[PDB]
Coordinates of C-alpha atoms and ligand atoms in Angstrom, one line a residue:
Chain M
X1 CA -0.7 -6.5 12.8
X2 CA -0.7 -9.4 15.8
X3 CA 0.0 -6.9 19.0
X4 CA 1.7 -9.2 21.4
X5 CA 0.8 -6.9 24.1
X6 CA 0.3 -8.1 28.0
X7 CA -2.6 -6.4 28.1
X8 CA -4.2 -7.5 24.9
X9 CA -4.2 -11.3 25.8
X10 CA -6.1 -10.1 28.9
X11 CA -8.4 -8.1 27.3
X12 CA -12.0 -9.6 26.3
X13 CA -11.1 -13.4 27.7
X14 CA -14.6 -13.3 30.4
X15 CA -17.7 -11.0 31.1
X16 CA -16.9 -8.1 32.8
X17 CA -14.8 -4.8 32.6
X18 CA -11.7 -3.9 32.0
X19 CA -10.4 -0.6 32.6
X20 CA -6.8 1.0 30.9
X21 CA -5.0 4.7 31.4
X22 CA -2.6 5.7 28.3
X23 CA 0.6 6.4 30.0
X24 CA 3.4 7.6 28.0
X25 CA 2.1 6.0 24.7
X26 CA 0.8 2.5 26.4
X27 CA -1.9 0.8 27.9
X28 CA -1.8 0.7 31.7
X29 CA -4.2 -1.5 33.8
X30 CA -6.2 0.6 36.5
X31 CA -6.5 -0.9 39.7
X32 CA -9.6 -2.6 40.3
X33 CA -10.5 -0.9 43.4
X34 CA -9.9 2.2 41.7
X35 CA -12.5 1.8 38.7
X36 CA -14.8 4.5 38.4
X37 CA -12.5 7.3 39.2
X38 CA -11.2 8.7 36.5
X39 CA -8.1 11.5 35.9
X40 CA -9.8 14.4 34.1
X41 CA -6.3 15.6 32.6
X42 CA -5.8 11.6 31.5
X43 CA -7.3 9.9 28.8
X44 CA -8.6 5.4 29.4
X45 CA -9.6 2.8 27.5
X46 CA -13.0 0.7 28.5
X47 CA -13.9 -2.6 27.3
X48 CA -17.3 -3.9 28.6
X49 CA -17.5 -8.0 28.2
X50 CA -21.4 -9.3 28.2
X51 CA -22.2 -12.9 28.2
X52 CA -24.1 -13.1 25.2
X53 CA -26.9 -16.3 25.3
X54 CA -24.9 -17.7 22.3
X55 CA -21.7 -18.7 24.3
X56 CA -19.9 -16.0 22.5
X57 CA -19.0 -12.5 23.9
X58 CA -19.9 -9.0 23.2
X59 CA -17.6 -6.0 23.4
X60 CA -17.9 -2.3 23.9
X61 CA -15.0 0.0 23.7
X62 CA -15.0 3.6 25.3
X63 CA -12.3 5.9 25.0
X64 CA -12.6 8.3 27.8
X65 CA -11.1 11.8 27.1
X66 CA -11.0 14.2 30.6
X67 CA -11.0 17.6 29.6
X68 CA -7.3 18.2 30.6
X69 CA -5.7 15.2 28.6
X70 CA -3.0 15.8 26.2
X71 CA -3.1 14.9 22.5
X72 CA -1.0 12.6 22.6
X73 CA -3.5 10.8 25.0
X74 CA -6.3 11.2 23.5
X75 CA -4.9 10.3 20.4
X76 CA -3.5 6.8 21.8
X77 CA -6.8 6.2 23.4
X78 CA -8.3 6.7 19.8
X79 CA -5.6 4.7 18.1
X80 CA -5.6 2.0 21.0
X81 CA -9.4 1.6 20.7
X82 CA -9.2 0.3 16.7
X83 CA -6.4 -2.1 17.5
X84 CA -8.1 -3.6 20.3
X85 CA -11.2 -3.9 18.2
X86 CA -9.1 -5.3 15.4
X87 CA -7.3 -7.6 18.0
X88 CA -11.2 -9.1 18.9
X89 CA -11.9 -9.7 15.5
X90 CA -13.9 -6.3 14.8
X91 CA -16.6 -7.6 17.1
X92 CA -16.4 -3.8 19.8
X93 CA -19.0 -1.7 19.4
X94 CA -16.2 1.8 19.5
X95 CA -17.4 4.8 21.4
X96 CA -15.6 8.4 22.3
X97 CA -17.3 9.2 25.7
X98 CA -15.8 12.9 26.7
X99 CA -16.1 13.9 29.9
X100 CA -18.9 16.1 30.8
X101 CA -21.0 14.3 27.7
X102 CA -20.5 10.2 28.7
X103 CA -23.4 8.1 27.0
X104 CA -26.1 6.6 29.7
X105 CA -24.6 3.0 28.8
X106 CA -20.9 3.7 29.8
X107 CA -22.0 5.7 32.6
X108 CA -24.3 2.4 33.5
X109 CA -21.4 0.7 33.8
X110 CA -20.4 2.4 37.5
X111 CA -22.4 1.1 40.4
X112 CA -21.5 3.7 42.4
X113 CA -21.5 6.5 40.5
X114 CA -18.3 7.6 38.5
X115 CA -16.6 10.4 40.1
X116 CA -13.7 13.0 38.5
X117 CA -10.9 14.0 40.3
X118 CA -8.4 16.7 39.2
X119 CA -4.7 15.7 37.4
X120 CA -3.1 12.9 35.8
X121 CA -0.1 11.7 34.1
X122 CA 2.5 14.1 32.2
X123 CA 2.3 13.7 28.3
X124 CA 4.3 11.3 26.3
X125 CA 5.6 14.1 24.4
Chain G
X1 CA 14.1 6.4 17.3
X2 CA 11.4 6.0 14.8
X3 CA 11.3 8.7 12.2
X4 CA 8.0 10.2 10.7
X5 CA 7.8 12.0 7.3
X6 CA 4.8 13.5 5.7
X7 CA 5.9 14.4 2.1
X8 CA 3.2 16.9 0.7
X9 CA 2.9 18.8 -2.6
X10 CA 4.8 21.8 -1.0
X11 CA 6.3 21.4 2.4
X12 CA 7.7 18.1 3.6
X13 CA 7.2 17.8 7.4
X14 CA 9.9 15.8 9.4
X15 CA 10.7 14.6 12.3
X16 CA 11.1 12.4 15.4
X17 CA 7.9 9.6 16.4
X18 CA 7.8 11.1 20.3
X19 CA 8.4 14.3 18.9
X20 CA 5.0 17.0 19.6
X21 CA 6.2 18.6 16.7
X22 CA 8.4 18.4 13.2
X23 CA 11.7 19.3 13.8
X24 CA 11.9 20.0 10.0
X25 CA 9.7 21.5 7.8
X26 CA 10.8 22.4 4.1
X27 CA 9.7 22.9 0.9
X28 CA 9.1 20.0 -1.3
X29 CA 11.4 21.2 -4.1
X30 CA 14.3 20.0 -6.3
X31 CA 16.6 22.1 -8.7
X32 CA 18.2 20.9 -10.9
X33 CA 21.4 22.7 -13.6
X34 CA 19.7 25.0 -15.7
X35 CA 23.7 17.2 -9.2
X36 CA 20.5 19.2 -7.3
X37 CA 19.5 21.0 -4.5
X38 CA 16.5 20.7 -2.2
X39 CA 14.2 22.3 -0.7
X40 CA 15.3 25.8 1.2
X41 CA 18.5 26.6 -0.5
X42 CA 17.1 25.2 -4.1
X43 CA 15.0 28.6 -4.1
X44 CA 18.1 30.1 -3.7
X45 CA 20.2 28.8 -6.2
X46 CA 17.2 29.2 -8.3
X47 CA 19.1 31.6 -11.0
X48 CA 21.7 28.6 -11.8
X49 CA 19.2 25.4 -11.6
X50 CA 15.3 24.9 -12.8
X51 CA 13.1 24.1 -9.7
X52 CA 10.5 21.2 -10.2
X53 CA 8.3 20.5 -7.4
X54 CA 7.9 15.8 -7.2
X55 CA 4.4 15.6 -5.7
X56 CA 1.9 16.6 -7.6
X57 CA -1.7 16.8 -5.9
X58 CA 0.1 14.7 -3.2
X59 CA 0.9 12.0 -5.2
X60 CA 4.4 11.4 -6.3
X61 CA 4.9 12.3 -10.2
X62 CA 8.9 12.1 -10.5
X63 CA 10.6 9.4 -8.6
X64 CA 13.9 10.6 -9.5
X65 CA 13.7 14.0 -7.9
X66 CA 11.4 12.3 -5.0
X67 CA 14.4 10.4 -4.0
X68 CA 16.2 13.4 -3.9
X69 CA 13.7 14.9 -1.0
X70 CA 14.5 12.2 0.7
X71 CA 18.0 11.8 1.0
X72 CA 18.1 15.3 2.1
X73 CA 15.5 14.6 4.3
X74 CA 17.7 12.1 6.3
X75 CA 21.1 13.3 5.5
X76 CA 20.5 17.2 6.2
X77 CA 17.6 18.1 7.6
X78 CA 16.8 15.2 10.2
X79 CA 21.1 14.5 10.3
X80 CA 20.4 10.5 10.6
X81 CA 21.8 7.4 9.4
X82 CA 18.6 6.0 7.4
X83 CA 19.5 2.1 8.3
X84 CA 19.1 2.4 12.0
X85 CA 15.7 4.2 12.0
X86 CA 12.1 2.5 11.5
X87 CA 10.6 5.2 8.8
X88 CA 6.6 6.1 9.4
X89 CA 5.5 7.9 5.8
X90 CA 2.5 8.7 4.5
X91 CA 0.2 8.7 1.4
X92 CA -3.1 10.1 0.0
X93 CA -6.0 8.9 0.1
X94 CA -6.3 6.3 -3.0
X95 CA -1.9 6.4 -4.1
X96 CA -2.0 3.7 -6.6
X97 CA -0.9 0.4 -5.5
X98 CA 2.4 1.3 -7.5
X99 CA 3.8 4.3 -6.2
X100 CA 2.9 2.4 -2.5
X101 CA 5.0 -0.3 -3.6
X102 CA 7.5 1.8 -5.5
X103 CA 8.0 3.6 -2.4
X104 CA 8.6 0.4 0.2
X105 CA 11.3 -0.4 -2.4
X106 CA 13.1 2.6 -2.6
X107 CA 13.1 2.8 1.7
X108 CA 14.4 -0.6 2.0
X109 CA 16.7 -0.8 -1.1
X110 CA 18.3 2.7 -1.4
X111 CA 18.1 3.6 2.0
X112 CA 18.3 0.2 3.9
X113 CA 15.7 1.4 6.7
X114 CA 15.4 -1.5 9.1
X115 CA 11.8 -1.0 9.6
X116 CA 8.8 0.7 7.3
X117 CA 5.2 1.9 7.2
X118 CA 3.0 3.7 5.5
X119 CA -0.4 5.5 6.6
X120 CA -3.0 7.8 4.9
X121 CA -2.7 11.6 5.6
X122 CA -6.1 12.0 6.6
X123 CA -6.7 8.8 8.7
X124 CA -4.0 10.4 11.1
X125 CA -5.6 13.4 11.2
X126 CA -8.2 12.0 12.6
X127 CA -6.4 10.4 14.8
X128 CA -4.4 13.3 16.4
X129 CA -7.9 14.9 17.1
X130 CA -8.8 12.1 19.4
X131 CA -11.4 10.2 17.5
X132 CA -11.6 7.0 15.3
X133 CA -15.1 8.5 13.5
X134 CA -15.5 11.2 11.5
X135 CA -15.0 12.5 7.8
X136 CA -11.6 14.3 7.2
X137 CA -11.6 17.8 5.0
X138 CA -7.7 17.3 4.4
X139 CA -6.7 20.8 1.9
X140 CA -2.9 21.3 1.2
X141 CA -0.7 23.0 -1.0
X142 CA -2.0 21.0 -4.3
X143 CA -5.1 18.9 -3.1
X144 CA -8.1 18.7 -1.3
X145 CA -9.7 15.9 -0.4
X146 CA -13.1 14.4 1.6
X147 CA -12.3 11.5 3.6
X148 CA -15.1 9.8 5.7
X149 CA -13.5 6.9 8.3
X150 CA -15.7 5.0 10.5
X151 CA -13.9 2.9 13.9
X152 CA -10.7 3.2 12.3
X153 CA -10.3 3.3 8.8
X154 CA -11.1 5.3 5.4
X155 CA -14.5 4.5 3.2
X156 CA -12.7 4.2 -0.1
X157 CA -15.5 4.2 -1.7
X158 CA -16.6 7.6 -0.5
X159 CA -13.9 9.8 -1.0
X160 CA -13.5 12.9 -2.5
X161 CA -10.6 14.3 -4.8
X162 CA -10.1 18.1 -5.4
X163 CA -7.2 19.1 -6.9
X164 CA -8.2 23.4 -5.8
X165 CA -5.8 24.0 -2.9
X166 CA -3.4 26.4 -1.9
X167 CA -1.7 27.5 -4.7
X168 CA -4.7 27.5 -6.6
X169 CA -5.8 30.2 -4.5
X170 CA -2.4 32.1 -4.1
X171 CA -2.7 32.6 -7.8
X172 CA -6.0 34.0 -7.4
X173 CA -5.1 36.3 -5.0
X174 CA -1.9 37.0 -7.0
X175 CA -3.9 38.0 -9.9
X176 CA -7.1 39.6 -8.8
X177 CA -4.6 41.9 -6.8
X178 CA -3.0 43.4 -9.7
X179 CA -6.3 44.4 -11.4
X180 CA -6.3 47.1 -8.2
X181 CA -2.9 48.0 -9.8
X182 CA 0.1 45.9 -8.5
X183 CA 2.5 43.5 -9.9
X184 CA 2.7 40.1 -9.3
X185 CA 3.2 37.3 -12.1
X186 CA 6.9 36.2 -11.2
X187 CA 8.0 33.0 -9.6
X188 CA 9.2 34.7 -6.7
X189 CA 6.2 37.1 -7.3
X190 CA 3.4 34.4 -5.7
X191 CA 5.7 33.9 -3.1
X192 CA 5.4 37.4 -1.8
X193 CA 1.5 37.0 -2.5
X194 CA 1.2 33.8 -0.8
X195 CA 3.0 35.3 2.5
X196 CA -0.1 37.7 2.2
X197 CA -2.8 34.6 1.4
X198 CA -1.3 33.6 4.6
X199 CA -1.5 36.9 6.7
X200 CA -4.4 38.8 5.4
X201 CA -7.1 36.6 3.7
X202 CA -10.1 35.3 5.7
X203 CA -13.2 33.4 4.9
X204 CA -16.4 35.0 5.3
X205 CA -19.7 34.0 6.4
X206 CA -21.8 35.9 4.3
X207 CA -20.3 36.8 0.7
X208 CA -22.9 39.2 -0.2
X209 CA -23.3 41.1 2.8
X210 CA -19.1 40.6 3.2
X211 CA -19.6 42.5 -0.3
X212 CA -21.9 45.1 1.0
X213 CA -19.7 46.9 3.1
X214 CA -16.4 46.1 1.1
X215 CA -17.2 48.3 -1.7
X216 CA -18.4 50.5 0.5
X217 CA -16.3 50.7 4.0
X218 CA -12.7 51.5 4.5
X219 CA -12.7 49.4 7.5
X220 CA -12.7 45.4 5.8
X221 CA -9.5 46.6 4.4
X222 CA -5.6 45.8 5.5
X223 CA -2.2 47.2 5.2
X224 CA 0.9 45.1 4.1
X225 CA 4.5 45.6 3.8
X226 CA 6.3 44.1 0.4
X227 CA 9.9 43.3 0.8
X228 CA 10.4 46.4 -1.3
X229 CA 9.2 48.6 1.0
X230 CA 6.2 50.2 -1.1
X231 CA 3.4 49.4 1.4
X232 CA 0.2 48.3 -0.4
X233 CA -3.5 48.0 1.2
X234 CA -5.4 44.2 1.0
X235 CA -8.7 44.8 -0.3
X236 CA -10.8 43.1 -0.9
X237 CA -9.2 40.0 -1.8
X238 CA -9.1 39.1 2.0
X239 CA -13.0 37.0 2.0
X240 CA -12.6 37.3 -2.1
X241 CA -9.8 34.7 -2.4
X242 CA -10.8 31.7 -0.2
X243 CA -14.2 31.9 -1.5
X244 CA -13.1 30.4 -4.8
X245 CA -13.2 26.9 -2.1
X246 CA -17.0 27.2 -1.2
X247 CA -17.4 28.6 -5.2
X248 CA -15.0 27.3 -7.4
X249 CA -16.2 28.9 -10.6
X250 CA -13.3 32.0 -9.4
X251 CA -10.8 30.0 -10.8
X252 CA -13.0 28.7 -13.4
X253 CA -13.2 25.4 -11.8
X254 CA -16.6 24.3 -12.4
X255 CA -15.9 21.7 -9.3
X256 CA -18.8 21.3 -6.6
X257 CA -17.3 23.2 -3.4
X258 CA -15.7 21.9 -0.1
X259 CA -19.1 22.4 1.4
X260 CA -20.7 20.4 -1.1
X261 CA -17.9 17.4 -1.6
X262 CA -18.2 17.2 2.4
X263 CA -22.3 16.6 1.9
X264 CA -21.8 14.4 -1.0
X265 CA -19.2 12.3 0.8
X266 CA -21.2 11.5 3.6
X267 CA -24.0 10.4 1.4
X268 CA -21.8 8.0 -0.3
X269 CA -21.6 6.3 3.4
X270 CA -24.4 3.8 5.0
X271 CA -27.0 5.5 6.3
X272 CA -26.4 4.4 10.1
X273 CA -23.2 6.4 10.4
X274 CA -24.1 9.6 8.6
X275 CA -24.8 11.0 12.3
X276 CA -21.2 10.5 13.5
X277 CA -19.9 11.7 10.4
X278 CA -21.8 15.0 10.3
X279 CA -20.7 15.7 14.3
X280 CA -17.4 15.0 13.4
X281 CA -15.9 17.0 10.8
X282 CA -12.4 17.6 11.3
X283 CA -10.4 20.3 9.5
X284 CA -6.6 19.5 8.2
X285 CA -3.8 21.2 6.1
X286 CA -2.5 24.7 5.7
X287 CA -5.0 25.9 3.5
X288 CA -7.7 25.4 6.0
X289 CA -5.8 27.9 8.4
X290 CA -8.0 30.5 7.4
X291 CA -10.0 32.9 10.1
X292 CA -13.1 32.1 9.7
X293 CA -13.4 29.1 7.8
X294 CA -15.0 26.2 10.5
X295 CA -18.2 28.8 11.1
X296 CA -18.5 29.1 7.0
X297 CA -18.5 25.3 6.7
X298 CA -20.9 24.9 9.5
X299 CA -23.5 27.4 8.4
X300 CA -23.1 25.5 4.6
X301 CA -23.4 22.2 5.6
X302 CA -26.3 22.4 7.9
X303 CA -27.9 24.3 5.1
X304 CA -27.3 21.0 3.0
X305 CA -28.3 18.2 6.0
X306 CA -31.5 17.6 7.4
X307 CA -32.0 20.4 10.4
X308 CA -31.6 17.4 13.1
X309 CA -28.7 16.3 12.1
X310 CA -26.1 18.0 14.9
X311 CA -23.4 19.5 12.6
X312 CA -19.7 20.1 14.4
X313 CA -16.5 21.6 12.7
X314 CA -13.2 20.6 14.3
X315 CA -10.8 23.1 13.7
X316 CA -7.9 22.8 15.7
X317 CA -4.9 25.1 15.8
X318 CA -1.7 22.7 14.9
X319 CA -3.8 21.3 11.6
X320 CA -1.0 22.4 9.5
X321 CA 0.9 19.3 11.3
X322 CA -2.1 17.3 12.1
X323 CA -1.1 14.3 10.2
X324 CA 2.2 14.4 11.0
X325 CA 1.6 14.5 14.7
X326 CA -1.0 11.3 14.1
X327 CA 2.1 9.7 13.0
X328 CA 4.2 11.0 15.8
X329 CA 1.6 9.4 18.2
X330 CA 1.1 6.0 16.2
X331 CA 4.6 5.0 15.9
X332 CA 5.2 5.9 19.3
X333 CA 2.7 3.3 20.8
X334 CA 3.9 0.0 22.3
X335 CA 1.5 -1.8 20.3
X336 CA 2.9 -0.5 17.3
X337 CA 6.3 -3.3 17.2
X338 CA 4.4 -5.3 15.3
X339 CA 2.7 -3.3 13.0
X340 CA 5.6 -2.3 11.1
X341 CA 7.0 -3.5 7.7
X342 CA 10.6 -5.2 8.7
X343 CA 13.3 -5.7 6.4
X344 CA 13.2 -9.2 7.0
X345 CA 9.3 -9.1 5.4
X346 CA 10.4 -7.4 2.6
X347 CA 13.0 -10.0 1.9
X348 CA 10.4 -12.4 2.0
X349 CA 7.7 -10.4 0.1
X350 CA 9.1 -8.1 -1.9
X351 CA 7.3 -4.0 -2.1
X352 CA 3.9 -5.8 -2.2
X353 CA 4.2 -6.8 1.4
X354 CA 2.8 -3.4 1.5
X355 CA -1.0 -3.7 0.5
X356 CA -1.1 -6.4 3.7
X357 CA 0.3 -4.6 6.0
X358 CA -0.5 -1.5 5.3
X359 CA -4.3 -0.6 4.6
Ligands
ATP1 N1 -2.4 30.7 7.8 C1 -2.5 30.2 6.5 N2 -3.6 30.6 5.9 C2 -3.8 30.1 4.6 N3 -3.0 29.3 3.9 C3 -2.0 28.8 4.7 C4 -1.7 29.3 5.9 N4 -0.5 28.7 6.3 C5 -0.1 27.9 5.3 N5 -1.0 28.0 4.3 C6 -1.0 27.3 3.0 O1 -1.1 25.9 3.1 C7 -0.2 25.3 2.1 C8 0.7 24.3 3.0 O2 -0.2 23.3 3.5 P1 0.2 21.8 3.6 O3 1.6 21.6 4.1 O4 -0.8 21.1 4.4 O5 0.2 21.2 2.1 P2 1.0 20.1 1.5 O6 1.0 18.9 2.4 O7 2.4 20.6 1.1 O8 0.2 19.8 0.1 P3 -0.8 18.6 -0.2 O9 -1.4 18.1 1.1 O10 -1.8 19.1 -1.1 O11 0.0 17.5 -0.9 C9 0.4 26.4 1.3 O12 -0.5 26.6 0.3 C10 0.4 27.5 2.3 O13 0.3 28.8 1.6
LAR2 C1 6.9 29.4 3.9 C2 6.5 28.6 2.7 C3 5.4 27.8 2.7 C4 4.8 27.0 1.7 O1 3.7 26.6 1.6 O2 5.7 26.7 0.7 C5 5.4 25.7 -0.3 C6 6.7 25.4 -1.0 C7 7.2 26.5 -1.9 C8 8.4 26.2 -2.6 C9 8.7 27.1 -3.8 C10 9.3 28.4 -3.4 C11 9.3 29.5 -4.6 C12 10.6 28.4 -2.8 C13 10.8 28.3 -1.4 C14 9.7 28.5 -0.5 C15 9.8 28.6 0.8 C16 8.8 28.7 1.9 C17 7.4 28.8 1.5 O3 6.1 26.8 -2.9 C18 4.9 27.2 -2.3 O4 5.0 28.5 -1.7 C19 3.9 27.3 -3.5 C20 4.1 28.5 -4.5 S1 2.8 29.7 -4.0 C21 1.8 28.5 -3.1 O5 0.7 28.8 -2.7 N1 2.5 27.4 -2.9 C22 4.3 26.2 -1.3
CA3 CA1 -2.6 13.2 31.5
CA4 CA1 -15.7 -3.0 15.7
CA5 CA1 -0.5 17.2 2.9

């Protein structure tokens, strides 16, 4: 392992969220105004960063699958989920939020509401 | 390109990382003078040369023919120079550490790859369905097995081995058939049953009551064409021969049955991820193709858990090439660069490189 990955040296460094779209096999950042809108034929990556009293973090990791994604999207969301856990040191909590069935705690993560909208990206394949 | 090969007891399934699908997909077979053929041609030539399949229960048993089934593998089915492609293969659950190192060595030494990796069938199963979590029913040509994987990666400790698969059952078929009167007992004999495995058979919910109304309805029966031209009528064998995987004692197995393993394996895991497990069972390998078979494991396992538990089967369509589509996907990832075994590392290392880079 190691990934040497742009987006892994951002991910996890201060409280917050971070918000990724697969695209053709890799790890996209969303636009910040965008969060909250999600692609129901994509698949993203979440990672919620919590000031823990400690000093230290804590991580949650949600893959988000729309109904429309492709396999190969949903599969590198799954795939990209471990090695970003591995990358933190297994601290991530991992969870598969599909749409339609999102846990209260990801969908607490969206002050506004999160909101669908119809398409996304063409497959990797 | 990166190339991704899943070698299993029958078929070998090969192909392009990128790729939605194998390009090739053969059987796993060497012939030898009765210096060898492989795979679809070595059936043919079958009168001249013995036939002897490498893997056995998807672990590799002769190394000699093995490397065979590979070279053809590169060289004639997938038509590439070996030293210019980073090679994705994969392993059962539990390969002893030899046969992982014996089979870094062999890539980089007689076929010079430039980059290498191994992964665990199953693990990529699970990760072509879209999930890091769940426990893997993986059931070939010559194993079974019962893998549960929580955030990632397999619970060693928990997995289940059955060698009952596929041809198991074909020669069940191919033998309870002939007591309605046919043929069948030639090694190009099972062959013809096995096309009919594959065409007729289904897995029933209820056995009895499949019963009730086999021996006694013209209607739970099927027609089928030989290659002779004799047709010959499937009965009853259609629910009869799968059955032998919930009830092994058919093939006088004595083994507990995929239901069971499946229940068993999960108890082997910590408590606090049973739940995730039990909502996440994902079906893999030919020999789960069978109509029918996600609604009979259902119905047996929630028998088995405690009635809160939320019991779901995943069976998707493409699970004869689930794992090697989970390869297709992992080797095609950006992040992935890294996570191979170079040639440069194995000059360093040497084959046990592998047991530190590859999980
Ligand atoms: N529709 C079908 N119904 C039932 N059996 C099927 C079907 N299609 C293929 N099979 C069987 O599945 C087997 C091929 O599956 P698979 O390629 O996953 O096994 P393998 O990888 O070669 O073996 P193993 O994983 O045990 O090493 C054969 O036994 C074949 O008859
Ligand atoms: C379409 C196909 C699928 C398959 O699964 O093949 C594998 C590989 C195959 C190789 C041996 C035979 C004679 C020669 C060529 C076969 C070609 C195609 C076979 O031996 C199996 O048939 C065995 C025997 S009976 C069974 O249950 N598995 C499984
Ligand atoms: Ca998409
Ligand atoms: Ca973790
Ligand atoms: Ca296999």
């Amino acid at each position: 392992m190691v990934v040497e990955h742009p987006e892994f040296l951002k991910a996890g460094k201060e409280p917050g969220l971070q918000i990724w779209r697969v695209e053709k096999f890799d790890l996209v950042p969303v636009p910040t105004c965008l969060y909250g809108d999600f692609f129901t034929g994509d698949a993203y990556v979440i990672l919620k960063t919590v000031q823990l009293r400690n000093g230290n973090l804590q991580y949650d990791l949600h893959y988000w699958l729309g109904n429309e994604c492709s396999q190969d999207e949903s599969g590198a969301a799954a795939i990209f989920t471990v090695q970003l856990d591995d990358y933190l040191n297994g601290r991530a909590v991992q969870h598969r939020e599909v749409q339609g069935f999102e846990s209260a705690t990801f969908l607490g993560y969206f002050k506004s509401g999160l909101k669908y909208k119809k398409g996304g990206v063409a497959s990797g394949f | 390109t990166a190339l991704v090969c899943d070698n299993g007891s029958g078929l070998v399934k090969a192909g392009f990382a990128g790729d939605d699908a194998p390009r090739a997909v053969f059987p796993s077979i060497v012939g030898r003078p009765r210096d060898s053929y492989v795979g679809d041609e070595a059936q043919s030539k079958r009168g001249i040369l013995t036939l002897k399949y490498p893997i056995e229960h998807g672990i590799i048993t002769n190394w000699d023919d093995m490397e065979k089934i590979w070279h053809h593998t590169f060289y004639n089915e997938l038509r590439v120079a070996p030293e210019e492609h980073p090679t994705l293969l994969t392993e059962a659950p539990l390969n002893p550490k030899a046969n992982r190192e014996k089979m870094t060595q062999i890539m980089f030494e007689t076929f010079n790859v430039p980059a290498m990796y191994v992964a665990i069938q199953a693990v990529l199963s699970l990760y072509a369905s879209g999930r890091t979590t769940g426990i893997v029913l993986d059931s070939g040509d010559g194993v079974t097995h019962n893998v549960p994987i929580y955030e990632g990666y397999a619970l060693p400790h928990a997995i289940m081995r059955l060698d009952l698969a596929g041809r198991d059952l074909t020669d069940y078929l191919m033998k309870i058939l002939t007591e309605r009167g046919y043929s069948f007992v030639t090694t190009a004999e099972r062959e013809i049953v096995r096309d009919i495995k594959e065409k007729l058979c289904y897995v029933a919910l209820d056995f009895e009551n499949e019963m009730a109304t086999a021996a006694s309805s013209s209607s739970l029966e099927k027609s089928y064409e030989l290659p002779d031209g004799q047709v010959i009528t499937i009965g009853n064998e259609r629910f009869r021969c799968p059955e032998t995987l919930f009830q092994p004692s058919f093939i006088g197995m004595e083994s507990a049955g995929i239901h069971e393993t499946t229940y068993n394996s999960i108890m082997k895991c910590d408590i606090d991820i049973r739940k995730d497990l039990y909502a996440n069972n994902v079906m893999s390998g030919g020999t789960t193709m069978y109509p029918g078979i996600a609604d009979r494991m259902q119905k047996e396992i929630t028998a088995l858990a405690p009635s809160t538990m939320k019991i779901k089967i995943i069976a998707p369509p493409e699970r004869k090439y689930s794992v090697w589509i989970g390869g297709s996907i992992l080797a095609s990832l950006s992040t992935f660069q890294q996570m191979w075994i170079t040639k440069q590392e194995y000059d360093e290392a040497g084959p046990s490189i592998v047991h530190r880079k590859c999980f």
